[model samples]
Target: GSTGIKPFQCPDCDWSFSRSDHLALHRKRHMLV
Candidate 1:
């Protein structure tokens, strides 16, 4: 683990990506609706 831990929340939750890269990855998953 070389990155920081941040509470990266989902657009509505259910996917709590506590990792920093998650929000960027997860947040990009369900894009464009």
Candidate 2:
């Protein structure tokens, strides 16, 4: 998959997303602070 237009894979977790914007938003859920 292309880095710019491809699915996003979270380096911190197993989360996978087709859109980077969504993945970025989803990462917020992992915050415990």
Candidate 3:
């Protein structure tokens, strides 16, 4: 849970998200092979 600013960064890509949920969801995309 985050508000105001986003600090979550993806270790596999150049994507950042304010919410951990969003980051998790985004990480799923990277898992696709």
Candidate 4:
């Protein structure tokens, strides 16, 4: 399997994303630092 063809999904909200980077951004819904 190629890394480029890998699918990404969010475990927290059942959200589907095209790329891992997009998923990562989606994962960060909100934060305060």
**Best model number under lDDT:** 3
Please identify which of the two predictions, 1 or 4, would achieve the higher TM-score against the true structure.
4
Q: In model 4, what is the error at residue 9, expressed in angstroms?
A: 0.4
TM-scores vs. true structure, each candidate: 0.43, 0.48, 0.54, 0.56
What's model 1's lDDT at 5?
31
Ten residues in sequence with the least summed lDDT for candidate 3: 1-10
Q: Please provide, for model 4 over 1-33, each residue's C-alpha lDDT reduced to its tens digit, 9 standing for 90 to 100.
A: 533433787777777789888988887783221
TM-score of 2: 0.48
Supply candidate 2's per-residue lDDT for 23: 84
Task: Summarize candidate 2's per-residue lDDT along 1-33 as a digit string, tens digits.
Answer: 644433687667667889888887878777644
Predicted structure with the largest TM-score when compared to the true one: 4
* Candidate 1 vs. true structure, TM-score: 0.43
Kindly list the per-residue Cα lDDT of model 3 for residues 1-33, writing each as its tens digit.
653445887877667898888988998888774
Ordered from best to worst lDDT, the candidate numbers read 3, 2, 4, 1
lDDT (10s digit) by residue, model 1, range 1-33 = 554435786765456676767676877767754
Name model 2 segments beyond 4 Å from true: 1-6, 28-33
